[PDB]
Symmetry: D3
Subunit: 100 residues, 6 copies
């Protein structure tokens, strides 16, 4: 049983300021999403993330992460994540879930 | 039944100028490909796209999309897509298809 | 049988200088990894690579490849790959393996 | 995709007299059924037959076959088959179909 | 996920006398078993029954059923079933369960 | 990966006399077959046996077993098995193998 989708995170002005969990990153910011599968799984599927859209300001470093936090049998938590003075205008993440 | 491949789009000088389908994007340009599976499927598989190569001009914003248009049981349509004054020297997209 | 993981390549100062295999690329450099599956396969699975982290210097072109070299039934070889005067501070590649 | 069912053939008085296709069998008789799957397949599934009910006259030899004739992607043909002076009061055949 | 096993029912002297659920059968008798899968399923698997052993008295009619009552995600109920004056000395039923 | 077939054992006059492995059975006799899969497996598949043909002498008890001895990744050993003064004129066993 394979499912898929796409999280459109958009402009980072609408992204949440979050506390950093890496000593090396300041001004960490994420558009986190708690996605639920249309068809629940028995056990956590394997989930893969793919950044399939990007629009980043050139005067500053490209700093992005497609972050997978957790996968349960019913859904997962993932985020568009940036830090320091990176400016993203848009970012989208495609994903697949596969029954393991 | 899982299949995979890689679309190498190359330099955007050889990419097609296309009409925009987003009010926010001008000078939209794509190297679209109509890929056919070696082994046809019964029903549309799930297809995932992954940008696995990039070479972009730094003096301008990074603007890219790995665009999936449609998936049929026999193939799919996907593209390297850019817009405005982004300059890409190369871009490749890896993909997988999975019987659902 | 689906397996997955993430190769964190880190700062390119710790990356290997390698001989180029493309006439168009000089100063080619890679953090290659020879990954072994926890559960060996019968036949080569299909493996997909996804760049899920990037931190690149803005004063120079973005040049990256998530390179898949080979897939055996027991593992695969993949690398973070860059060239010319691109500077990457970090890069991570997520992957999945699927019994075909 | 796995499907299953059960063909109840009943008393052989309601069974068809058919021409023999084995030089060694006379008075051959079958309750043939042309079963269609609820969900069509892409390719012929593998089908297994299992006799799960029997009620046979003891004064004569037990002669039975659970006969699989053909499997298409949409269905299959199978039969309760007997010959000579065997008397069956009932016979049922369970089956499974599996996407190969 | 495929599981399998074998229910050995043995001599019908140790079988339970049960009330008939078919107007046409008297003296109905079964060795019922409530089998639990080693690995629980998400949803009811498909279960197939196969009589793989038989030892029946010849002076009376062969009357047997390999009866599947119910399949849950955790197990199933099945029985060796006989009726009237059939005498079975042994009967075994093999089974498979398949994730659907 | 599902495979299937049918072992036709024929008349028990051509069957081997074997030493009994059950204290309760004398004159044990089997047409054993060592079947190899067309496509080898990684691990032992699950194999199911189904008697799909029978022709037994009525003046003596019906005594039959569809015996599965062992399953390896490359094949399996199974037999038509009878004992005491049972007379079988023919017996066929259908089987399936399923990657577990």
């Amino acid at each position: 049983r394979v499912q898929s989708g796409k999280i459109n995170c958009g402009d980072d002005a609408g992204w949440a300021k979050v506390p950093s969990n890496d000593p090396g990153r300041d001004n960490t910011r994420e558009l986190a999403k708690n996605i639920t599968f249309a068809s629940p799984y028995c056990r956590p599927p394997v989930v893969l993330l793919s950044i399939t859209q990007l629009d980043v300001e050139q005067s500053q470093n490209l700093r992005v992460i497609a972050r997978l936090y957790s996968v349960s049998p019913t859904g997962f938590k993932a985020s568009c994540y940036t830090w320091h003075n990176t400016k993203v205008y848009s970012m989208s993440i495609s994903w697949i879930s596969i029954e393991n």
